[PDB]
Scaffold this active site. Structure first.
Site, mmCIF file in Angstrom:
data_model
loop_
_atom_site.group_PDB
_atom_site.id
_atom_site.type_symbol
_atom_site.label_atom_id
_atom_site.label_comp_id
_atom_site.label_asym_id
_atom_site.label_seq_id
_atom_site.Cartn_x
_atom_site.Cartn_y
_atom_site.Cartn_z
ATOM 1 C CD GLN F 11 -3.016 1.101 2.093
ATOM 2 O OE1 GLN F 11 -3.070 0.360 3.072
ATOM 3 N NE2 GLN F 11 -4.069 1.771 1.644
ATOM 4 C CD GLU F 246 28.309 8.843 -12.757
ATOM 5 O OE1 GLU F 246 27.730 9.746 -12.118
ATOM 6 O OE2 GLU F 246 28.898 9.044 -13.839
HETATM 7 N N1 LIG Z 1 5.205 6.945 3.716
HETATM 8 C C1 LIG Z 1 4.027 6.329 3.723
HETATM 9 N N2 LIG Z 1 3.868 5.148 4.420
HETATM 10 C C2 LIG Z 1 2.671 4.519 4.433
HETATM 11 C C3 LIG Z 1 1.597 5.050 3.742
HETATM 12 N N3 LIG Z 1 0.541 4.232 3.916
HETATM 13 C C4 LIG Z 1 0.921 3.197 4.694
HETATM 14 N N4 LIG Z 1 2.236 3.363 5.026
HETATM 15 C C5 LIG Z 1 3.047 2.454 5.849
HETATM 16 O O1 LIG Z 1 3.039 1.171 5.248
HETATM 17 C C6 LIG Z 1 3.001 0.164 6.238
HETATM 18 C C7 LIG Z 1 2.291 -1.096 5.746
HETATM 19 O O2 LIG Z 1 2.235 -1.146 4.339
HETATM 20 P P1 LIG Z 1 1.617 -2.439 3.603
HETATM 21 O O3 LIG Z 1 2.329 -3.698 4.021
HETATM 22 O O4 LIG Z 1 1.705 -2.252 2.112
HETATM 23 O O5 LIG Z 1 0.065 -2.511 4.020
HETATM 24 P P2 LIG Z 1 -0.950 -3.430 3.168
HETATM 25 O O6 LIG Z 1 -1.093 -2.991 1.734
HETATM 26 O O7 LIG Z 1 -2.294 -3.500 3.852
HETATM 27 O O8 LIG Z 1 -0.247 -4.868 3.225
HETATM 28 P P3 LIG Z 1 -0.187 -5.686 4.602
HETATM 29 O O9 LIG Z 1 -0.335 -4.712 5.743
HETATM 30 O O10 LIG Z 1 1.138 -6.394 4.690
HETATM 31 O O11 LIG Z 1 -1.302 -6.703 4.638
HETATM 32 C C8 LIG Z 1 2.304 0.791 7.430
HETATM 33 O O12 LIG Z 1 2.930 0.392 8.624
HETATM 34 C C9 LIG Z 1 2.451 2.287 7.236
HETATM 35 O O13 LIG Z 1 3.322 2.815 8.206
HETATM 36 C C10 LIG Z 1 1.749 6.232 3.040
HETATM 37 O O14 LIG Z 1 0.798 6.701 2.426
HETATM 38 N N5 LIG Z 1 2.966 6.872 3.031
#
Ligand SMILES: Nc1nc2c(ncn2[C@@H]2O[C@H](COP(=O)(O)OP(=O)(O)OP(=O)(O)O)[C@@H](O)[C@H]2O)c(=O)[nH]1
Ligand SMILES: Nc1nc2c(ncn2[C@@H]2O[C@H](COP(=O)(O)OP(=O)(O)OP(=O)(O)O)[C@@H](O)[C@H]2O)c(=O)[nH]1
Ligand SMILES: Nc1nc2c(ncn2[C@@H]2O[C@H](COP(=O)(O)OP(=O)(O)O)[C@@H](O)[C@H]2O)c(=O)[nH]1
EC number: 3.6.5.-
Lengths: 50, 77, 53, 431, 430, 430
Positions: F11, F246
């Site tokens: 996500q 680089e």
């Molecule tokens: N920088 C940033 N981090 C984000 C954002 N949205 C979520 N995160 C971080 O991404 C982490 C988890 O991402 P994902 O593993 O892709 O969440 P998911 O798509 O539901 O997949 P799973 O949680 O593994 O089931 C969270 O702990 C957040 O801290 C965002 O919009 N910007």
């Protein structure tokens, strides 16, 4: 091996020239077997004339 | 040329194709095709040159092929 | 076993299309039939032999 | 007044011959309707070499087109220069040879060959003096290679003394078009060795390499390759058609090029082949043309000269140049690359000069090299032919067209003997 | 001058013929009434006194419903009324019924009309038999007609575009039976047999066309596009012209090995169109992808023997040469050792025309890859045990025996297919 | 010619890629539909014959919602529909779920599309993998994809722009667990991994952008600007051109040590813009300020090993050299004894474009500082006890075990991270 290659190409070129002479002989033989029936026909007319 | 090359290669092709039992050929091709069928049915898609070579390894079919050695040639000499 | 060789098996369509291939197929059939006769013939009983002293 | 009878065979040969006639008509100032519009006396001086004067001012090419399918010469007739040729010179069958040399040489070429020889004899008897015949075709194809070899044999029988020149498009090394190319080439080389007096070897992939590395083209159709081949075919005979400071006819080229009769296969090249971008950046000098001429990429043949040894090499220049310049340049080339030149021939250069360059170019130069490098091309063709022939794949069609299976052994043996000639005269030592 | 006679036997044959002839009419501009508002139609159409173009086709069936659908449909004024031949009783998926008892008079009338059609042709490249291996009409009657054509016509090249049973999904129960019988019949009578599988075409429609509900009309549209791409060189000029007679010479290493996989590319809808490059190299790679093959058979299992490519549209010999060189250098695609070239490329300047109401998009490039490969023995291995499993119990054998067949005929067909398996193994071997 | 393949896993990866591609389209003038009203876009887009430009990107997720948001949003006609890949069951913040059970088919399809994308690229500078360390999708699936890319592609420079869990603030519970797992997984595959922390970026937004309510959109916009500044040298010419290949040689001292702090400057709202001179020296000092780091890691604790600066806009080599000389003479900034230069300066003539609706102001000068420093071991020290505090009680271990884990895998990850700490201390010490 050097001597063998030397004799190889001498023998081969001589054989090729012999084959060329044979082809030329075939060509002349055909070219004059073309003429021979005319001689035969003239002979027949000659005999009938006597 | 016939006796030295073609007769030899056809004789070695025979007694190998002949040696291979028809039942064994059918079973081998069946295991291969059922592996492909199973991976097609389970996985959403099948790609060449992309396989994991763990669940389905099609190249094993090419591995299980008759190989014939080589002798000598008279025409090339 | 003793299956007819691949390069020598002319299908009926190919035999109809190309007469020389049909003739070759018939010749190969004749040869395969002939091959059995030599094997079936008992090759034993050599000629009577006259030795002399 | 020394005439040449042109013959086109197969689809590739017919296309190349049409392009060649377009180029020749452009050089002689002949519009596609046959009228002369060249505004030069020299152009009409020797127009009889390639053309005959018709009932009006029209000039008809001395060309004979052969095919087993009508589509190729239908396209040729619909092409820009399709109306110059006499309709009686278009000889076609109805069923094309399915890339089968046996079909094009034995079954389907047999009936059409009578008409072909009739038209050839009609064209040859009209000539006051006949230099010879030139057959443009492609090895590795059914009707092209088959009818080309058959007609070459027939013409050799009829006119043994007349020159025979062939432009054969040998199947390419790396990317092949049809499956039976090695078979067709192996069958054709056997006939070309025995019958054709002088033969040029061409490759589609070599032409592609030269057109991308020298010409730097982006999308080269077959037309560009045909244009390059046509330029070479014009330059080989421009001495007959135009006055030259040191002229040389086809028989002179053959005598100076062919050390032994069976070693009559040559690689050709045309200079200056320059990219559109570097037209201004290059300078037209005789040393420049010689440097491009002796480059391996400039050969239209896949075999690179570097591996082999140059038995002989002719260079026909066109344009106002110094014979001293040409002779010094080519002697310098021989001295510099003496390792690549055969030792037991003191001079490997046949330099000729014509006074009329091609249109647009201030000067040009065509190169015809007899080198032992083509040994590797014949070796590759054998490496394919043996690979298929050991299993007799694709062989039943040829067997069914009424040619014996022993003929393939004959052809491969003869081609391998030619390979042996090239290798032994490559490694031959003086004294 | 380049005439080819088309035969359509059985429901599947007639239904793919509907698509094929719609495609040819759309390609040549022939209106469904029969006439159009040079001479490129001669391969498929002969023009009559009114200027009306009639196709050189014959719709043969023992069931009247399928043919009457054509007699009533939009193509009622195009085809010849006697060219549409209808039986009285269906073959009922019985090879014996379609080959021995009912099919006799119908095939006699079929040869009569075929002779009439052939007498209308100066030249004759050959026959295009479109049937369904797996049904009495398709198998039995088609086999009988192929036998009769081989007997009388002789040298005409007969290309059979056979539709074989899918591996797991199927609609008939005696389908392995009549499929094995028809395979034995056409192993010696057709010159080039093209394999088609409904399951593979369904997968192609599901993935490439994104059609979750493919149907017979969709399948026949893809088949028609494949056949039109095959014949395009006969009707339109292009670089590297390809011929019906040279399909064999460039494709059939040995007469037995003449069954051929077919794959079309690209298979893309309008929405996915103009979204990727669709270059020659990419479409050639797609054509050699296992998913694009119209037969449920992994090409990676066997080794390719020969591959004939038919390009349509803006294709240049450099592009085809580079694509084929990349394919040869590719490690996954494996060719036999005895065929170093194994490639027959042919281009056509006519891009594939798109049938209105279809799902295929207007693509300026198209490839029809027809490959002779030893992998196809694998589907034959499937049918060979689907046959013998039932043959052990002799299930549905009385149905075939009743119309003049014998246990020996089933045994001979199965033995011939086993010999074909042995042949495939040997030719794959070195 | 300078193509770079963009991958967005999870996500967070997809949501930062939304901002990244919005920024790229705005920078190149490419309208969201796909086509724009030389060849500077080749790094990120491939243009079609119709004129539509498709990004060389792949949106990978096991959850349908995030990808469907793209499929429905404004950029529905830009991306390739098959490039958007959607799973069925989410990884549930389980590394084992995203790497061992659910992720297999998805990563297979991902490698297929990656191969197709790379086949359309003449050159290939590398991969830009955007995921979030600390979630089952991002960690597990991203690790599997990186492993497969290392196996097949090999030496291509993979830049992993990972978002690591913040020290105190967090949104997950097993985030230390899957973060340790992912760190162990990618320590051996990615060539340059860039650390980002939500807490640090939130602090940046609060103090510099004066956003009292920072959100994911603003965080992603900042990350997108950083990546665009990093890649500006591939697309726009300028003095001191910098290359992806680089980056590794000028930034990675030892193969294990390839994690980088990132800091952008200036980060000023339009209201506060044009209220300072924003000279090269001042923006360099701001970039070197500890507050400007996008990772909650005080650089004063450690010592800088390398600092690669990317300048965008009106920057002259005299100004950049004066600024870096002042930085070196500054006592607060401390470099290791064995890297006397420690600086990789690059300039570009293309100022960073401003996204309409964003908070960043149109600044004619910008600096992106990417630094390899031993201070980054502090975050590893935090996660190493956040891991073991839970691991002593084996909390949430059964969940990972359910998808095929063992206590040995967790032990190996912990030991490898301890080894990473040891390597950081060793390189930091004289
Ligand atoms: N920088 C940033 N981090 C984000 C954002 N949205 C979520 N995160 C971080 O991404 C982490 C988890 O991402 P994902 O593993 O892709 O969440 P998911 O798509 O539901 O997949 P799973 O949680 O593994 O089931 C969270 O702990 C957040 O801290 C965002 O919009 N910007
Ligand atoms: N691909 C494709 N296959 C079809 C289509 N229509 C029928 N088939 C196949 O054809 C097979 C049966 O065809 P036929 O034998 O001609 O059926 P019929 O016309 O009633 O004749 P019999 O069944 O032999 O009595 C079925 O197994 C189908 O799978 C079609 O439109 N497309
Ligand atoms: N240079 C050139 N080569 C061609 C052309 N057309 C075909 N070829 C090549 O010529 C080779 C032989 O084809 P060809 O003998 O003409 O086929 P055939 O007419 O049926 O015998 C093929 O492999 C083609 O690659 C062309 O227009 N120009």
């Amino acid at each position: 091996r050097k001597e063998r290659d030397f004799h190889r190409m001498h023998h081969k070129r001589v054989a090729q020239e012999k084959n060329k002479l044979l082809t030329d002989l075939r060509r002349l033989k055909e070219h004059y077997a073309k003429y021979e029936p005319t001689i035969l026909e003239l002979k027949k007319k000659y005999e009938t004339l006597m | 040329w016939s006796t030295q090359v073609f007769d030899t290669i056809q004789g070695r092709l025979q007694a190998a194709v002949d040696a291979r039992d028809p039942a064994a050929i059918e079973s081998r091709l069946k295991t291969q095709y059922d592996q492909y069928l199973h991976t097609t049915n389970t996985k959403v898609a099948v790609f060449r040159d992309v396989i994991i070579e763990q669940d389905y390894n099609p190249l094993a079919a090419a591995d299980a092929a008759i190989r014939v050695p080589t002798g000598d040639i008279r025409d090339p000499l | 076993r003793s299956r007819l060789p691949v390069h020598q098996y002319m299908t009926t369509a190919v035999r109809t299309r190309i007469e020389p291939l049909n003739a070759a197929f018939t010749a190969t059939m004749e040869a395969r039939t002939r091959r059995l006769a030599d094997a079936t013939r008992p090759p034993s009983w050599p000629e009577p032999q006259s030795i002399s002293v | 007044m020394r005439e040449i009878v042109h013959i086109q065979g197969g689809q590739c040969g017919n296309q190349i011959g049409a392009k060649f006639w377009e180029v020749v008509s452009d050089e002689h100032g002949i519009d596609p309707t046959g009228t002369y519009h060249g505004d030069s006396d020299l152009q009409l001086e020797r127009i009889n070499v390639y053309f005959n004067e018709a009932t009006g001012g029209r000039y008809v090419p001395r060309a004979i087109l052969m095919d087993l399918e009508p589509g190729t010469m239908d396209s040729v007739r619909s092409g820009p220069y399709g109306q110059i040729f006499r309709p009686d010179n278009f000889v076609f069958g109805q069923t094309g040879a399915g890339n089968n040399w046996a079909k094009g040489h034995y079954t389907e070429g047999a009936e059409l060959i009578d008409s072909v020889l009739d038209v050839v004899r009609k064209e040859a008897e009209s000539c006051d003096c006949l230099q010879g015949f030139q057959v443009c075709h492609s090895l590795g194809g059914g009707t092209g290679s088959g009818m080309g070899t058959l007609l070459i044999s027939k013409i050799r029988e009829e006119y043994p003394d007349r020159m025979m020149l062939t432009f054969s498009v040998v199947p390419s090394p790396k990317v092949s078009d049809t499956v039976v190319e090695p078979y067709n080439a192996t069958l054709s080389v056997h006939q070309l060795v025995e019958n054709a007096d002088e033969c040029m070897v061409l490759d589609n992939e070599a032409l592609y390499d030269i057109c991308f590395r020298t010409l730097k083209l982006t999308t080269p159709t077959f037309g560009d390759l045909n244009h390059l081949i046509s330029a070479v075919m014009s330059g080989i005979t421009c001495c007959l058609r135009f006055p030259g400071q040191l002229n040389a006819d086809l028989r002179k080229l053959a005598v100076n090029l062919i050390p032994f009769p069976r070693l009559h296969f040559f690689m050709v090249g045309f200079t200056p082949l320059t990219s559109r971008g570097s037209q201004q950046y290059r300078a037209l000098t005789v040393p420049e043309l010689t440097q491009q001429m002796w480059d391996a990429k400039n050969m239209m043949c896949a075999a690179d000269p570097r591996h082999g040894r140059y038995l002989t090499a002719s260079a026909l220049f066109r344009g106002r140049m110094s014979t001293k310049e040409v002779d010094e340049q080519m002697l310098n080339v021989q001295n510099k690359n003496s390792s690549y030149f055969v030792e037991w021939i003191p001079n490997n250069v046949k330099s000729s000069v014509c006074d009329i360059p091609p249109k647009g170019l201030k000067m040009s130069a065509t190169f015809i090299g007899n080198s032992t490098a083509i040994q590797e091309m014949f070796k590759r063709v054998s490496e394919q032919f043996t690979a298929m022939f050991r299993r007799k794949a694709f062989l039943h069609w040829y067997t069914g067209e009424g040619m014996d299976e022993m003929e393939f052994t004959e052809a491969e043996s003869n081609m391998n003997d030619l390979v042996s000639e090239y290798q032994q005269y490559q490694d031959a030592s003086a004294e | 001058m380049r005439e080819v006679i088309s035969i359509h036997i059985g429901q599947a044959g007639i239904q793919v013929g509907n698509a094929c002839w719609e495609l040819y009419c759309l390609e040549h501009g022939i209106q469904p009434d029969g006439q159009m508002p040079d001479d490129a139609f001669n391969t498929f159409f002969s023009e009559t006194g009114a200027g009306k173009h009639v196709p050189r086709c014959i719709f043969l069936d023992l069931e009247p419903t399928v043919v009457d659908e054509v007699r009533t449909g939009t193509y009622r004024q195009l085809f010849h009324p006697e060219q549409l031949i209808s039986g009285k009783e269906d073959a009922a998926n019985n090879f014996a019924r379609g080959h021995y008892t009912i099919g006799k008079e119908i095939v006699d009338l079929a040869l009569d009309r075929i002779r009439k059609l052939a007498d209308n042709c100066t030249g004759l490249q050959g026959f295009l038999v479109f049937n369904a291996v797996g049904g009495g009409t398709g198998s039995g009657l088609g086999s009988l007609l192929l036998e009769r054509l081989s007997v009388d016509y002789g040298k005409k090249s007969k290309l059979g575009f056979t539709v074989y049973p899918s591996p797991q999904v199927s609609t008939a129960v005696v389908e392995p039976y009549n499929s094995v019988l028809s395979t034995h019949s056409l192993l010696e009578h057709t010159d080039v047999a093209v394999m088609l599988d409904n399951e593979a075409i369904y997968d192609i429609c599901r993935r490439s066309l994104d059609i979750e509900r493919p149907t017979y009309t969709n399948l026949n549209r893809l088949i028609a596009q494949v056949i039109s791409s095959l014949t395009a060189s006969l009707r339109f000029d292009g670089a590297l012209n390809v011929d019906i007679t040279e399909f064999q010479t460039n494709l059939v290493p040995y007469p037995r090995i003449h069954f051929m996989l077919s794959s079309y590319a690209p298979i893309i809808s309008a929405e996915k169109a103009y979204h990727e490059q669709l270059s020659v190299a990419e479409i050639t790679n797609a054509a050699f992808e296992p998913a694009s093959m119209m037969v449920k058979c992994d090409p990676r299992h066997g080794k390719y023997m020969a591959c004939c490519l038919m390009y349509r549209g803006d294709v240049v010999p450099k592009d085809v040469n580079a694509s084929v060189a990349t394919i040869k250098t590719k490690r996954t695609i494996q060719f036999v050792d005895w065929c170093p070239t194994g490639f027959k490329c042919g281009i056509n300047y006519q891009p594939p025309t798109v049938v209105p109401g279809g799902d295929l998009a207007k693509v300026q490039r198209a490839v029809c890859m027809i490959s002779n490969s030893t992998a196809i023995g694998e589907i034959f291995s499937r049918l060979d045990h689907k046959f013998d499993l039932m043959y052990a119990k002799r299930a549905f054998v009385h149905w075939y025996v009743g119309e003049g067949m014998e246990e020996g005929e089933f045994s001979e067909a199965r033995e011939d297919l086993a010999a074909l398996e042995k042949d495939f193994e040997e030719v794959g071997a070195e």
